[PDB]
Scaffold this motif. Structure first.
Motif, PDB file in Angstrom:
ATOM      1  N   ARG A   1       0.784  -1.311   0.192  1.00 13.20           N
ATOM      2  CA  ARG A   1       0.156  -0.155  -0.015  1.00 13.20           C
ATOM      3  C   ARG A   1       0.915   1.181   0.084  1.00 13.20           C
ATOM      4  O   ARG A   1       0.751   2.077  -0.865  1.00 13.20           O
ATOM      5  CB  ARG A   1      -0.872   0.108   1.222  1.00 13.20           C
ATOM      6  N   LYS A   2       1.887   1.150   0.945  1.00 10.12           N
ATOM      7  CA  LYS A   2       2.791   2.354   1.078  1.00 10.12           C
ATOM      8  C   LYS A   2       3.367   2.612  -0.468  1.00 10.12           C
ATOM      9  O   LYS A   2       3.461   3.901  -0.718  1.00 10.12           O
ATOM     10  CB  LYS A   2       3.922   2.283   1.906  1.00 10.12           C
ATOM     11  N   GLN A   3       3.968   1.713  -1.039  1.00  8.80           N
ATOM     12  CA  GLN A   3       4.647   1.826  -2.171  1.00  8.80           C
ATOM     13  C   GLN A   3       3.853   2.456  -3.284  1.00  8.80           C
ATOM     14  O   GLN A   3       4.257   3.129  -4.184  1.00  8.80           O
ATOM     15  CB  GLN A   3       5.254   0.328  -2.774  1.00  8.80           C
ATOM     16  N   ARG A   4       2.378   2.087  -3.382  1.00  8.46           N
ATOM     17  CA  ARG A   4       1.334   2.622  -4.451  1.00  8.46           C
ATOM     18  C   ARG A   4       1.441   4.067  -4.455  1.00  8.46           C
ATOM     19  O   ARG A   4       1.445   4.626  -3.257  1.00  8.46           O
ATOM     20  CB  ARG A   4       0.044   2.210  -4.284  1.00  8.46           C
ATOM     21  N   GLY A   5       1.554   4.843  -5.465  1.00  9.45           N
ATOM     22  CA  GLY A   5       1.671   6.167  -5.486  1.00  9.45           C
ATOM     23  C   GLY A   5       2.868   7.047  -5.637  1.00  9.45           C
ATOM     24  O   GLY A   5       3.962   6.101  -5.599  1.00  9.45           O
TER      25      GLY A   5
ATOM     26  N   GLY B   1       8.121   7.460  -4.541  1.00  6.58           N
ATOM     27  CA  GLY B   1       9.373   6.667  -4.345  1.00  6.58           C
ATOM     28  C   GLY B   1       9.321   5.654  -3.237  1.00  6.58           C
ATOM     29  O   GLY B   1       8.276   5.181  -2.985  1.00  6.58           O
ATOM     30  N   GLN B   2      10.645   5.236  -2.932  1.00  7.05           N
ATOM     31  CA  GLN B   2      10.716   4.104  -2.022  1.00  7.05           C
ATOM     32  C   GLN B   2      10.031   4.727  -0.465  1.00  7.05           C
ATOM     33  O   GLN B   2      10.568   5.606  -0.148  1.00  7.05           O
ATOM     34  CB  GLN B   2      12.203   3.602  -1.744  1.00  7.05           C
TER      35      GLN B   2
END
Length: 93
Positions: free
Chosen positions: A42-46, A49-50
């Motif tokens: 979820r965090k990676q989506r959007g 970047g990392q």
RNA sequence: AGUUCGGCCAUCCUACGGCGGAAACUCCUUAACUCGUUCCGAAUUAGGAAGAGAAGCGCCGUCAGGCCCCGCCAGUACUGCGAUCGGAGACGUCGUGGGAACACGGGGUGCCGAACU
RNA sequence: CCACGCGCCGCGGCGAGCCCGAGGGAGCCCCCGCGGCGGAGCGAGCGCGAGACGCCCCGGGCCCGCCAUGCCCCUGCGGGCG
RNA sequence: GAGGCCCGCCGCGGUGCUGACGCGCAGAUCGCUCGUCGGAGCCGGGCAUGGGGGCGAAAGACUCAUCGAACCGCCUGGUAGCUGGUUGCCUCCGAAAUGUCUCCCAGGACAGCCGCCGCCCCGCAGUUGCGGCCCGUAGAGCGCUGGCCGGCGGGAGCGGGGGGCCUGCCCCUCGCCCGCCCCCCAAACUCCGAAGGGCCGCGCCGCCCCGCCGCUGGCCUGGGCGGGGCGGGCGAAUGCGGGCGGCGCGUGGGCCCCUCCUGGUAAGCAGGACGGGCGAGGCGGGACGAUCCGGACGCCGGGCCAGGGUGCGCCGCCGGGGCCCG
RNA sequence: ACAGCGUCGCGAGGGCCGCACCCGGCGCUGGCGCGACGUGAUUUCUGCCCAGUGCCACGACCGUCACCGUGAAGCGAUCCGCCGAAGCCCUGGUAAACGGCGGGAGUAACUAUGACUCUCUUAAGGUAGCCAAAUGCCUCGUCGGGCAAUUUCCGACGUGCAU
RNA sequence: GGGGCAAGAAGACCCUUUUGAGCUUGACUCCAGCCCGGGCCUGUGGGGCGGGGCGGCCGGCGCAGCGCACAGGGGAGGCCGCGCCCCUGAGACACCCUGACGGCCGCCGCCGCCCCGCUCACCCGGUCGCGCGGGGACCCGCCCGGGCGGGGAGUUCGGCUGGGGCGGCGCGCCUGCUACACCGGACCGCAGGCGUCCCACGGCGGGCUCAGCGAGGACGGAGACCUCCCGCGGAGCAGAAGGGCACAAGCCCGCCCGACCCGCGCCCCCCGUGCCGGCGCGGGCCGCGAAAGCGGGGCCUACCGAUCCUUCGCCGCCCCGGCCGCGGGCGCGGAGGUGGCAGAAAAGUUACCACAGGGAUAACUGGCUUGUGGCCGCCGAGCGCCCGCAGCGACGCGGCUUUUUGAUCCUUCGAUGUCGGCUCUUCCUACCGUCCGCGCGCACCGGCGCGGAAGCGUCGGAUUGUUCACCCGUUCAAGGGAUCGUGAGCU
């Protein structure tokens, strides 16, 4: 180093010492449904970047090897973590 | 006297040379088994008993080595606490305390308990 | 400096209680006025659940929960007892 | 009569002088001296291109005295472990520059020191004396671990030689091997072994009977833990009431004087340590010096007198013995 | 900057740029064109190297490499296969792409010098020229010339720190 | 114009800051842009060729038989124009005859691909829509997915450090020193290590004695081997170092895995916190030995790692309105990690450079020290025909000096303008000539060495920024101090 094909070790399910056969522990395939794996996705989506730290500098030559041991009579599972070894192998009985 | 179990572990050790065994202890003598040897009954395990002080051992003995005890070394070497104490220093005094070591000379050279004979 | 939160101290009221909350009362500083907080804890949780002493303090002993263990038995992976 | 030709006026640039001026005539001016002057020339007006954008015969140049990213307002009184400053008095108490950690080393946090607030009743010491343990530093020694210089021996070893030998170690000599000795040594040597330090003790002793213990034993054994009697007493000096919490603050760059140091050739040098000092301690002396020698402070009046001195500055001295080109 | 000189892309259903988007510029252009880059008039020339890094190939089609799509299995979340577009890889080309362009040892009958060998070593080992250069550390190099006297200067020499 | 380190100006030099900006790339993490596929937009056809739904056709011996009874069959009746249990097989072909249609013609919105059209969508060109074309269900657009992508963004680019960098790793740990006899004491101080290696190099019981001297024995000696001896370890015990150890901790042999499980405490470090390592225990469960005993590895001191996330074991708990399967969560204690080792996820450059500060710190002056640079004096091995000393003088030895250079940072960074010259002035003597003596290995001339002596002189020039250096000349030509004298004096 070498480990014995079977070591008589205490088996908790039986409650007494019984012979245990030996294999070597490995990491299981990580499910995409693990709480942390789901959160990382979820965090990676959007855009952005990392979103989590990536360990980069490895400083350890080899990993301590954990020997899975199974007791035949009780189907007990036990693990003995030997000191770090650049190569270890289970001896044939 | 001697044995078996011990305590401190050289005053009890080491090397040598005497002396002694009544008993004890050892030596010894044999594998029928038990047991036993990288090979070997040497050791070990058995089963003894004809011997025997040669050892082991118990005692002596060495201007023996060691180990020990006392002097002496010596108020010496160091050093604690002070000093407008000297000295260019680094070193040494002085006051007030604590005081070695090696050598060297003399002297030593096991004792204790429990059971037993 | 002020606001808010926290820790602790001192005081004042009341005490297993305590409290101008917002509000509402031809009511003005008066009157009435909930939550909350405390009184029970502990265990991730299912849940289970403190009395034994004591001027005070302090250790000890016990009790409760959690982690075991072993016994006994109903309304049983339930209960009780060590 | 040709030429991105030449000289040269105005113009357009700006080379030198390192000239003048440099609080300027002037936030770039002035004087000579210059480069160019029909050209890729110069000049005026209109217009277009706008900010990480333009424009640039490129110099990060230029874009309204700003440009390796304009200007105005705003977010914004952005943030700073970094600088500077931070406002009356008297009294009482009064530090630290250290330890562990941390992207820390210009900072913090926990601990220590310290202040206030206390609360509570047990006894108390940076001390000496006495008793019992500990230590491996100085010294000393070379037994041990290595370094070390040469003598006196005694021989199995010709290691070489010099060599009488058919030849040969059959002929001797030093080395070698030991032995006795001896000269100097140690951080990473200890036979021994200090001074000096550390630690613990110095009041309740006995006697006797039970009680209790899923703990211990062959036991009627213990070991603990309790209760009652019955005897004895306070049994080193000196000084002195202790104990414990709560709540914070500063500080966490230190530096000197001794004494032992490491290290560098050596320093007002660089790191360590016992104590004291300055820091944060006035006052007197050392001519002068934050630390040296004395003395450590309310406001004072006498007296005493430390340390240092006593010809004169400049308070205060003489006497005797010795020495003499400070 | 410049003329000159090359290299590069592109035949408009295209190239290169602007550009929240709608739409634009080059272009009222068309290869004697337009854009992109180097080098910088002549005169004389431009050596060798495609290892590496770039770039380019209906140059391939191996190995890799996605979404979908489609197989199985499941109660379904799903899970394993398979397919595999570019791209990479792979195979060639390309240095007026960026760039790179070596050492020891022995030798001639003056001595010396080294045409000549030998031996490692590269993608290639620096060619034509040029030199103590605005490039040479050593170094104020050596030798001429110029001066009474020359760390400057000029003509030479040149395994040239590092042309 | 000598000073007022005269005023500029919170130094841009050198650091430090968990302060920045411009640039770069092959930094970290990315975004426009583009290429590339699959969908949608988006119609109407012709096929090939498999599939694929229909969709005919035929099947069919253990046959024991009434007879290719396929099996499934079955009756004794009908309509070949014949039967018939029990035939054997289970049920024989009677009126009889047979699944999956087992193999196997034709029809259809069936799917999959490779084509090929058409026009009408969707585009494109001409024209004054003046008597027209082109492409075409593809591109385009969009949604997804894969590339490429300093062309831009945002950000990072450790530490200690006798300034910084560079190197080194006192960045985590261990032994012996240093360390100055409890403990604790530093140094980019002194030697070395550690990140492993071993189910045997472990646990346990048994037996044994080890190195080596000696002296003896076929080949046998330098060396191989075996014996009686004596052997305090002079051997060994994995690896650094130091301790430790002899019927063992060595060595060999036999068994075994305690190199278990469940829960706790103590010591080291220490804030009395972890972490690593150790140790002492209470329970089980094993091993070895006759037993007592010992064993949670390898004699001790080194040899490794928190939150979060992942994985794996083991028993249970929870999904909150219940119930059942799946799955997720959790308690639990192991692994996967942070070596910058109590633990960010991370490259350069800047002379275009800013900040905030700092002499907590470099540069340049000082000042301290003095290896270095000079300058003296002590000794005489020796030389000088002879002969230590006329002049010398080794090896050594002791001092001075600031004129150099190192070291050290004590002062200066809200700034003390920095080298050499020119100009000018003073000072020093450690004296080159001139002056005065005196000694020579001084006949004269000239040299040389001393002691006193700082009045005077130490010049003109060629290269170089030179100080220096060097050369040419001449009345032949010492060396130095003044913030390395001397920038509102200059250059």
């Amino acid at each position: 180093v070498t480990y014995p094909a079977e070591r008589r070790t205490f088996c908790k399910r039986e409650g007494k010492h019984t012979v245990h056969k030996a294999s070597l522990y490995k990491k299981g395939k990580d499910s995409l449904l693990a709480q942390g794996k789901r959160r990382y996705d979820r965090k990676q989506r959007g855009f952005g970047g990392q979103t989590k730290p990536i360990f980069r500098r490895k400083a350890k030559t080899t990993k301590k090897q954990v020997i899975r041991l199974t007791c035949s009579s009780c189907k007990c599972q036990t693990f003995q973590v030997l000191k770090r070894c650049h190569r270890l192998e289970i001896s044939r009985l």
